[model samples]
Target chain A: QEMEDLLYRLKVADETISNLFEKQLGISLTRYSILQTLLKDAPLHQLALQERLQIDRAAVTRHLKLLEESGYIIRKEVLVWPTEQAREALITNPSAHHQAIKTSMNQILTVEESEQFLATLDKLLIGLQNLPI
Target chain B: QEMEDLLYRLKVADETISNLFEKQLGISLTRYSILQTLLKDAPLHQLALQERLQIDRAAVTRHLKLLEESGYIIRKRNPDNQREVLVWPTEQAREALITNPSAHHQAIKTSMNQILTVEESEQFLATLDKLLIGLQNLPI
Candidate 1:
């Protein structure tokens, strides 16, 4: 039952963040995740993005299409390797709509609480990673 | 910076869970949250559900309407309090679509890990609750 409760909290956290993105930013978390991942490690091929993000290939393709359609990202297929420009006008625009989503999410916790949560999460993830599938 | 990283991880967790719901159960996490909350404390008034779930009143009304329309729940307005009813057949069905959502969620962690992890979360939550107090300390 403890595991059940933890999953429930995780679910709540997910719902809250999704609602934050949708209501505030008018973008889905999936799209944001891809963009953030690319921002961190750009110049990677589409397959690499899918692997790094743990997203299905088809889903990643679909998200990339949507991002391209919205003009928030541009993908260029090269002879050697295809690279993607994750930071487009909307993403790079500092004064864009709902720029405060970052601040609002940060306001959910203080510096100290955030530190503790990260440390604890790291430990939890380590444990999970060690478990047998 | 630490807060930013925590928020990022929280975002990842949220994405994973939402994807799990959508891909596995074909339902949004928002709907599941409402249903789970009601299941725990059913037979309560609509306003109570809204308050308990921390969902907006209008959003709760809309969700209740959808739930009713899907035959998953029934809503009846009481003559005394004009309260709405909740719970219907689809909710009561033992063998339903995507019953594995619960088990799959549980499988994310083990028992001991879950217990220790929850303790850590509770401690972190206490710290956040205290921070909230300081944040709300506005001057007149």
Candidate 2:
């Protein structure tokens, strides 16, 4: 049951990070990701946005609707772009969000530990991704 | 963005496991968990079952309702107390659980085990636990 246990711990860790990141930023990781993606490229097709985000199509549509309602984005038919508000909000203190994440991670692991963990995580992902499901 | 990468990798791993497990066993992990618990101890109080599962009470109720509909489980009122409900796995559930999943489960375990050496696996698990603690006990 080691793999089962590993998956459970991974789920907990994933949820905890999302909760902490949202609590600290007053914005969900999904929302942040949407704005961040738009900030890089403008007038992106909605389909392209979904592809880049690698989330469910319905999820991207729902978040785009929410972002549009919140005035963070403007949609032109199938195309979408971030509003100035989004740029200003997201760009103003990108470091704060990064720091929030970094601080939480560092509180748990040393620099060396972080390197080792990431390496192992990469290995795990590669192994699973390459497995013939 | 090590943290961002970490979160992404974790999400992928979690999704991969769920998808593969469901495909292999034709049952979700959550449902498997529900059945496994009842197999070990039957006629358990609903409240006790929820606590043992460590999932939301509402989730437990919803799953129990579905399982009952599927004829895999039966929930009954406690004889002594009207307010308490007890849950039990059906013979069908027992038979299905015993016959269907063991080989698939072992195959998954074997695949995962082959990916890491014993020392690497131990270190990975230890590091994972530390990160879990940090995430869980965050003050902010």
Candidate 3:
């Protein structure tokens, strides 16, 4: 149950972060990530948007469709642009997830405690990435 | 970003555990937990499973359907308890919990060992738990 506890906490932490990040920002964790990709190249072609995701073929990058329909993204000609609302959400949210991690990591553990834990997690992430999800 | 990396690791770990547990034990982590809850007493009402998990309805339904399809469990009715629908592990499910735990435990142990000493890990996990609690209590 210790492992279970660990996984549950991590899951909860991840979700809590994303939820906070989203509620304050009006963007989901997924949409924020899409925002990250598009931030690099706004006004991207429809196909280029899908291509840039570099995700598995099956995922197909359909998030753009939803975002466009939801009004966060605007499509014009062969390109996509972030709506003013989207841009505001992207810029104005004051690090909801980021601040939570830092404060929690600080109040809860010393540098030694956090560093090793984070490193271990990073290692597992790399290992898991090597396998199919 | 560091935050992205943290969530990614947690999601990956959760998936990795379920995959390892399922591939080895022949029960997905979901099914195994279901088995655990049932082991306290065999054959629980389907609603109990829903209440215990408290997950999204679609997700709960999805796993129950898969477990049934895979023959990992049996679904029937409980006459003693309002004659409502209930699901319990099959003999195959019992066998699943019995075997392949070593691989599951070892992989987790090895990963934790590689990352931090057990002492540090307990502390780290405890801290993370506290962190989660704080997030939960944080005013919207």
Candidate 4:
């Protein structure tokens, strides 16, 4: 029962964060996530981004279109493989109003709390990755 | 640097879980979440659901339409309130394949690990709630 409750709470937390992104940012958390991932490893092919992020190919395409249209990011198809923009308006102008949406997300956690949460989460990820897929 | 790494990881975990929901369950995690909330406290009005879930009114209406059409739930209007539907799929059917989507979400956690902790997620919640109210009430 306790586990059930925890799962429920996590689900709620996930939803709450998502709502924050959409309500405050005017973008789905998923889209922001894709942008953040691309910023970290820019010039990545669409297929690579899809694989590393565990998102569907079509969904990634849709998000790319939005980012491209908004001038937040861009994608180009080279001779061999398509590559995406590494840094966009959001990354370049991190202090701009548009970027504030992403910044505000981290305001809820202090530096210390965020560190502790990350350590526990890293252990969780290691366990999850090792599970038989 | 550590905090940055942690935020990055948490964001990745969030994406992974969302992908799992969409790929394996064929529904947005948001939709599943709304359903779970309603299941816990059914007979809720749309405004109540909107307020509790912190979702947009338009978005909530869209979700309600999907839920109603799929027969997973129902709604009825009250003559007094001229309001919304109360509960559709009035009878509970446990273990159905459709319901399995909600069930599979729990498979990740062990029973013992789930229970032993209950920190003031409320602190996080209170902070967000305060922020959301401020956002909603922000003057345009």
Q: How high is each candidate's TM-score?
A: 0.56, 0.75, 0.62, 0.54
Best by DockQ: 2
* DockQ of candidate 3 compared with the true complex: 0.25
Give DockQ per model, in order: 0.15, 0.42, 0.25, 0.19
Clashing pairs in 1: A14-B14, B76-B85
**Top-lDDT candidate index:** 2
Please tell me which predicted candidate would have the highest TM-score against the true structure: 2
- Give each model's clash number: 2, 0, 0, 7
Q: Model 1 - which docking category?
A: incorrect
Model 3 accuracy (lDDT, Cα): 0.59
Scored by lDDT, model 2 comes in at 0.72
- How are the candidates ranked when ordered by DockQ, highest leading? 2, 3, 4, 1
Q: Which residue ranges in model 3 land beyond 4 Å of their true spot?
A: A1-5, A8-21, A37-54, A57-60, A69-87, A92-117, A126-133, B1-5, B8-26, B40-43, B56-58, B75-87, B99-121
| Overall local distance difference test of candidate 4 | 0.53
**Winner on DockQ (1 vs 3):** 3
Per-residue accuracy of model 3 over B1-140 as CA lDDT, tens digit each = 34443443454456555565456444555555777667556677676776675556677688878888987778886768665777777776655554444565445534533544467557667767655565455444
lDDT tens digits by residue: candidate 4, B104-132? 43344342244233553334334434444
Q: Order the candidates by lDDT, highest first — what do you get?
A: 2, 3, 1, 4
Residue-level lDDT of model 4, residues A6-55, one tens digit each, is 33345555565556546655666666666666666566777877776566
Which digits, one per residue and each the tens of the lDDT, describe model 1 over residues A7-126?
Answer: 456655545545545555555766766667666656678877767666787897887888778666666642112123334422555433444545455566656666776676566555
lDDT of 1 at B32: 57
